[PDB]
Amino acid sequence: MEEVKKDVYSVWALPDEESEPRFKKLMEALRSEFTGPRFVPHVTVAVSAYLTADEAKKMFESACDGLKAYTATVDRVSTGTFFFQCVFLLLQTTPEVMEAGEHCKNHFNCSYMPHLSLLYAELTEEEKKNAQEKAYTLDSSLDGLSFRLNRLALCKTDTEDKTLETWETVAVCNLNPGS
DSSP 81-114: EETTEEEEEEEP--HHHHHHH----TT-------
Of the listed 30, 63, 86, 115, which one is catalytic?
A: 115
117 annotated as ligand-binding: yes
Of the listed 9, 14, 42, 45, which one is catalytic?
A: 42
E strand map for the chain: 7-15, 43-51, 70-82, 85-91, 115-119, 146-156, 168-174
112 annotated as ligand-binding: no
- Angle between helix 20-33 and helix 125-138 axes, rounded to 10 deg: 140
Would you give the distance in Å from CA 158 to the centre of its chain? 14
Q: Which amino acid type is present at position 8?
A: V
- Check if 103 is active-site: no
Three-state DSSP class for 19? coil
CA distances from 150 to 19, 45, 108 (A): 11, 13, 27
CA distance 75 to 90: 6
- Check if 115 is active-site: yes
120 annotated as ligand-binding: yes
Question: Residue positions in the annotated binding site for substrate?
Answer: 44, 117, 120
- Residues at the binding site are 44, 117, 120
Catalytic residues: 42, 115
